[PDB]
Amino acid sequence: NEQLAKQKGCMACHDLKAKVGPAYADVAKKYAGRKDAVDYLAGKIKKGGSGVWGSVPMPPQNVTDAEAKQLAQWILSIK
Amino acid sequence: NEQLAKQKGCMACHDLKAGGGKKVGPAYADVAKKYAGRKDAVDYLAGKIKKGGSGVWGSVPMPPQNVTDAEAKQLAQWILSIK
Ligand code: HEC
Ligand code: HEC
16 A cells, blocks of 8 residues: 555655656556556566666756756766 | 756756666766767757757666565555556
């Protein structure tokens, strides 16, 4: 349940409904028909992994050309 | 600068340094390392900052989790029930 998921840190990366990982409602939809969904998901919860789910993209941002340049220059200075 | 990045919501998805695992975007230190010394780094990154995109940094991994078999199955069963 949510209380267990919260205790174990899961909710830092997952929401119940549509964070970095897939929302649980979407995981449920994807694996609804899969006979061994519980065994499969239990293994994936314990082991982790990558690339099963498409990544969250970067949206366009509310910045002027000059702000974008300032931000690029600032990021390049983190070294 | 950093304050402008905070103002514009950038830190919702980016940390300065890697290790958190919880942010959707790459750490700024890793962006800086990738593009350092590229002649058009500023103009290239400025464009990406304004427009966004996807595909350059790939997946964010899920780390392994210290849960028992029973806990993992309990969580899986619960997750499958979410509407
Ligand atoms: C706490 C024990 C949990 C539990 C129960 C789950 N997670 Fe994660 N998770 C994260 C990311 C980026 C992904 C995508 C991985 C990929 O695309 O391959 C996932 C994935 C899952 C799933 C789906 C697995 C599948 O094969 O479909 C499930 C059921 C799941 N998680 C449950 C990110 C994170 C975290 C970021 C640091 C952490 C913490 C968790 N997840 C923790 C948990
Ligand atoms: C606020 C204005 C910012 C700024 C300055 C940056 N971002 Fe993001 N970002 C996000 C994701 C998922 C990625 C990876 C995209 C991919 O894989 O292609 C990025 C990427 C970047 C970069 C690197 C671009 C490159 O071509 O290498 C840079 C410089 C960058 N960002 C700066 C996710 C997010 C967000 C999620 C909702 C938000 C908000 C931001 N980023 C905001 C900003």
